[PDB]
Amino acid sequence: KALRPDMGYNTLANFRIEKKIGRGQFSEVYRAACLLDGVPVALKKVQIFDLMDAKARADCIKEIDLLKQLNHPNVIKYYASFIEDNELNIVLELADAGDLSRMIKHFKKQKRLIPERTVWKYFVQLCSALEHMHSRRVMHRDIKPANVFITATGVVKLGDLGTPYYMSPERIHENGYNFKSDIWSLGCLLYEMAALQSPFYGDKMNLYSLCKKIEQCDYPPLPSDHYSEELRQLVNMCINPDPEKRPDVTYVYDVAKRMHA
């Protein structure tokens, strides 16, 4: 037929969807191929029309215009951000083999769980990325294993920022999203990597029960006889109801570095 003209870098005709990498409630991600360039990227589409109040989507596009300039070895590369097919179109780097969401499920098959050395090696890079973006006042909206990607070389790439996977203490009793909310999400991610599961799993799947669980900050401590004391306490500090109780991004990055050494 007549594909859309392949003139610019912002058009669906310039992309060939090899398959659907995943389908989240907020976005659908496909393994696209830039016809004009010729590289496999990730095309994420969100139905803006549904949750389009016209007061958030415009600012979202304006801010996501800043993101390609975000050049860090441990952060997903932002290629394109446009509107087409009555929905958004975001072109990013593709890391299929590296997806903590699938890695945790695969490891849960085996009785033995992940090693402290590997988790530290990934966590140092995660802290580096978080500190690099925070120093520019930019934050990761949602940090989760499903949105943290790695590569064959061993590098950890932070996925595209989006009930969320992790409910911040500031989200509960909603007052805002502080720099320490990212610290809380990162600590919960550390716990998830450590135990193959988030620190707020249980039979009682009701919102009030889990909200009070977060408020009381009660979780099954990570296995002491397989994980380190300093790491088990760092996760505890990062997971705290008090905003300032959570250590700062630079602090967590420095401790991560001194442990990776």
Binding site: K19, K20, G22, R23, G24, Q25, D96, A97, R102, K105, H106, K109, Q110, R112, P115, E116, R117, T118, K121, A152, G154, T163, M167, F200, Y201, G202, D203, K204, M205, N206, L207, L210, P223, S224, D225, H226, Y227, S228, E229, E230
Partner: protein, 584 residues
């Protein structure tokens, strides 16, 4: 020597270089292997001290002992107070005046302003640390409490990184024959119960479940290495069995090798490397010589093809007792796959293998299946996730599945197997005698076409138990195709994972029929699928019956309403043995 640094530096003293070169000459000419020879950093200092304190005419044996102890306490309190450069006042405070003619005390005098002052100093910081260790070991204003445990925990945190060497030299001195030699040299008996105190500290550290505050596993390995006492090392290493160590220098290689060789109660070992085959040769040789090993974690290590060849050569040893070896992200390829197949065909002890993120390729899988189809192949579980494989090797995979008598579970997800590859695998797995039990096609790009073949495999093979198909957009047609087979009484599946399967609300009736009929499955995970509140309600309505033999249901990532959440909680609490995971 150049491997060891604490010695290369202090080798500038010509006497302390001769003391280390004659030591190696003795081993060289006494029919021994220097490649396995050891040169502990404390023997050199013991011999240096002995050579220096030559009796200059029979006189004041007690005086020499007293002045050595005074200098020794000087070194000890200097190390505690970070007193690199002492002064005449401190030398007088400690029992000292003259006599000690700068053997380890060089009067370097510094001029400031108009006049210069003494500022006594030790020949070197390591020497002063050794003297502090000798102060602790030897037997008796007040210098730091002789609590060996106190010094030990001070070395264990409290920002006293400047105590690793004092502890190391204490361990070197607590050596039995070395301690006796020092006793005969200085006419002063030593205390051996400090050795038992250190052993109890190592016991606490080992019964600390990798507490690694500071006195980590590598630090304790170095301590025992410098101890060099065989019986003590055997008696102390027994608490290690779970060990996680990484190497960055030849000294680390040697310490780890000696400690592992002396270890008799080692089962789980994780090894990492920074910056290979030369030292890894000996390291893996000692590992293979070890007979109590069970696990080998080489993941996150850039072993390379030469490294994998060395590893397989070591494993080929008849005495190899390695049962599990995980090689995730080790940079392995088809070339090393040849040696891997050789190992599989030769060794009869191998039980499982995980080679995730390995550039095996079609040629790699071709080489691997050659070993797998060997009659001696006793491997059971195989993980090749994200191995970059395709349906081309699926022929060999199916052949090995139909041939081997031990290979049971295979997980080759994250590979471009495709519908054709899945059908090729199924054409062989359908054999009832086939031993495949748990099948995983994690994100294998499967469609509904292979669903019928997989259903045929389920109905034919009676050994399949668990099925993971995450990352495949089967659709409702594929869901119904699978259900048609899993409803068959011959189906023996127990767990079914179908997340990221691109399943709509249509498969709701398929799954309801499966829940109402299927009498073998126990776990069903279907998250990341918009089945809907209607689907969840129908499933709960079917579940509230006592006929639901399944026990686990997973609807994670599914977003519902308050009514649906309340209904799910009510069902879960009405059937405590039946759990539904739908957390936010």
């Amino acid at each position: 020597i150049q491997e060891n640094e604490v010695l290369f530096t202090m080798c500038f003293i010509p006497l302390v270089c001769w003391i280390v070169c004659t030591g190696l000459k003795q081993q060289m000419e006494s029919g021994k292997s220097l490649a396995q020879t050891s040169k502990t950093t404390t023997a050199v200092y013991v011999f240096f001290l002995s050579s220096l304190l030559q009796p200059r005419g029979g006189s004041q044996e007690h005086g020499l002992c007293a002045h050595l102890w005074g200098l020794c306490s000087l070194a000890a309190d200097g190390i505690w107070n970070q007193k690199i450069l002492f002064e005449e006042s401190d030398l007088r405070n400690h029992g000292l005046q003259k006599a000690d003619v700068s053997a380890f005390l060089r009067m370097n005098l510094f001029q400031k302003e108009v006049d210069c002052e003494k500022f006594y100093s030790f020949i070197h910081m390591t020497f002063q640390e050794f003297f502090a260790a000798m102060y602790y070991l030897l037997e008796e204003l007040k210098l730091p409490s002789r609590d060996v445990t106190v010094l030990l925990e001070n070395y264990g945190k409290f920002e006293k990184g400047y105590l690793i060497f004092v502890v190391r030299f204490l361990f070197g001195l607590v050596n039995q024959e070395r301690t006796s030699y020092l006793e005969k040299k200085l006419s002063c008996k030593i205390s051996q119960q400090i050795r038992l105190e250190l052993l109890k500290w190592i016991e606490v550290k080992a019964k600390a479940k990798k507490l690694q505050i500071q006195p980590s596993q590598l630090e304790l390995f170095y301590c025992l290495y410098e101890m060099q006492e065989e019986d003590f090392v055997q008696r102390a290493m027994d608490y290690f069995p779970k060990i996680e160590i990484n190497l960055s220098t030849r000294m680390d290689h040697m310490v780890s090798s000696f400690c592992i060789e002396n270890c008799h109660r080692v089962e789980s070992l994780s090894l990492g490397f920074l910056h290979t085959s030369s030292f890894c040769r000996g390291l893996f040789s000692v590992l293979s010589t070890s007979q109590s090993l069970t696990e080998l974690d080489l993941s996150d290590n850039s072993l390379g093809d030469p490294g994998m060849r060395v590893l397989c050569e070591t494993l080929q040893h008849p005495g190899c007792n390695i049962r599990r070896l995980w090689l995730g992200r080790c940079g392995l390829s088809h070339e090393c796959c040849f040696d891997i197949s050789l190992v599989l065909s030769s060794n009869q002890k191998l039980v499982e293998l995980d080679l995730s993120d390995n550039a095996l390729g079609d040629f790699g899988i071709r080489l691997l299946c050659v070993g797998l189809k060997h009659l001696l192949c006793n491997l059971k579980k195989l993980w090749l996730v994200s191995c970059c494989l395709t349906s081309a090797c699926c022929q060999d995979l199916a052949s090995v599945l139909s041939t081997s008598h031990s290979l049971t579970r295979l997980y080759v997800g994250e590979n471009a197997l495709g519908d054709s590859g899945v059908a090729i695998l199924c054409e062989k797995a359908k054999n009832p005698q086939c031993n495949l039990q748990k099948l995983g096609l994690v994100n294998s790009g499967l469609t509904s076409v292979c669903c019928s073949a997989l259903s045929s495999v389920l109905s034919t093979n009676q050994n399949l138990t668990h099925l993971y198909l995450r990352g495949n957009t089967l659709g409702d047609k594929g869901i119904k195709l699978l259900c048609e087979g899993l409803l068959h009484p011959d189906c023996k599946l127990q767990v079914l994972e179908l997340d990221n399967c691109n399943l709509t609300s249509h498969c709701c009736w398929d799954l309801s029929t499966l829940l109402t009929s299927s009498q073998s499955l126990r776990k069903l995970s279907l998250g990341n699928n918009d089945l809907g509140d209607l689907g969840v309600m129908m499933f709960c309505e079917v579940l509230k019956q006592q006929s639901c033999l399944l026990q686990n249901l997973g609807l994670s990532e599914m977003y519902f309403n308050y009514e649906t959440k309340s209904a799910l909680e009510t069902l879960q609490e009405e059937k405590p043995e039946l759990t539904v995971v739908f957390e936010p």
